[PDB]
Amino acid sequence: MYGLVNKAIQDMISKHHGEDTWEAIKQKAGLEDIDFFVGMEAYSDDVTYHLVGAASEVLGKPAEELLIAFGEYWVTYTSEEGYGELLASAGDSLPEFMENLDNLHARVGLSFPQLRPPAFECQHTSSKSMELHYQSTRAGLAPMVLGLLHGLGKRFQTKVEVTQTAFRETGEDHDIFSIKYE
Ligand SMILES: O=C(O)CCCCN(CCc1cc(F)ccc1OCc1ccc(-c2ccc(C(F)(F)F)cc2)cc1)Cc1ccc(C(=O)O)cc1
């Protein structure tokens, strides 16, 4: 993934657990060569997976729990590190944001060819609910998407409940989430 994702993980862990713990996690993951992450440089996905695995071992939390935390963090982090206006342009409510996300990533993709944006499709079931189909070229990030949705509920001051109903990791076509929101 683009370096920005790995910088954001470094930032979350550092802010939350201190530099010592981050350095440890960095070393466990086998990444002490890499001095800083370059935000607009494409990295092998494995660098990301290895950071999450290693942070899981070091902090004593499951990877999927860290992904949820990380998903929430991403929404705030990117707003503060140069994508505040981009996120604003995506809408002023949770459903509109999820509707615009494929288009938001298109705009990211223009400058940055190695972007592999996931696809998000909304089937709105009422004015307070939707089925969300999440289609990704990556495995194992559904819990991050859970975190992301909560990051957005916070951003828009909307209470939101997310329940996954189809699981890509068990060989289903794609993750599907049932969402209820204020
Ligand atoms: O499944 C998957 O593959 C990954 C799913 C999890 C990650 N994705 C979250 C999408 C999301 C979901 C959401 F609900 C809310 C917010 C969200 O973010 C808004 C946002 C999205 C992206 C940038 C940005 C900014 C800059 C750059 C660059 F580095 F300069 F290139 C790159 C991306 C900013 C804001 C972002 C993503 C997607 C693909 C890649 C890549 O392929 O590398 C990297 C990151």
**Domains of the chain (ranges plus CATH)?**
1-182 (3.90.1520.10)
Give the determination technique: X-ray
As a whole number of angstroms, the distance between CA 117 and CA 76 comes to 19
As a whole number of angstroms, the distance between CA 176 and CA 48 comes to 23
- Which residues contact ligand 1 via a Cβ below 6 A? 1-2, 4-5, 39-40, 75, 78, 83, 101, 108, 112, 115-118, 136-138, 141, 144, 148-149, 152
Expressed in angstroms and rounded, the spacing between residue 124 Cα and the centre of ligand 1 is 23
Which atom of ligand 1 is closest in space to residue 145's alpha carbon? 14
Which atom of ligand 1 is closest in space to residue 134's alpha carbon? 1
Nearest CA to ligand 1 atom 23: 108
Q: Find, among 124, 112, 127, 138, the residue nearest to 182 by Cα.
A: 127
As a whole number of angstroms, the distance between CA 123 and CA 77 comes to 28
Which pair of tokens denotes residue 123? 């089937």
As a whole number of angstroms, the distance between CA 154 and CA 149 comes to 9
Annotated binding-site residue numbers for heme b: 2, 74, 105, 116, 134, 136, 138
Annotated binding-site residue numbers: 2, 74, 105, 116, 134, 136, 138
Strand order in the sheet with 119-124: 119-124, 129-135, 175-181, 160-166
- To which residue do tokens 């991050």 refer? 144
Which atom of ligand 1 is closest in space to residue 75's alpha carbon? 16
Alpha helices in 18-80 (DSSP H): 19-28, 45-59, 63-80
For residue 4, give the 3-state DSSP assignment: helix
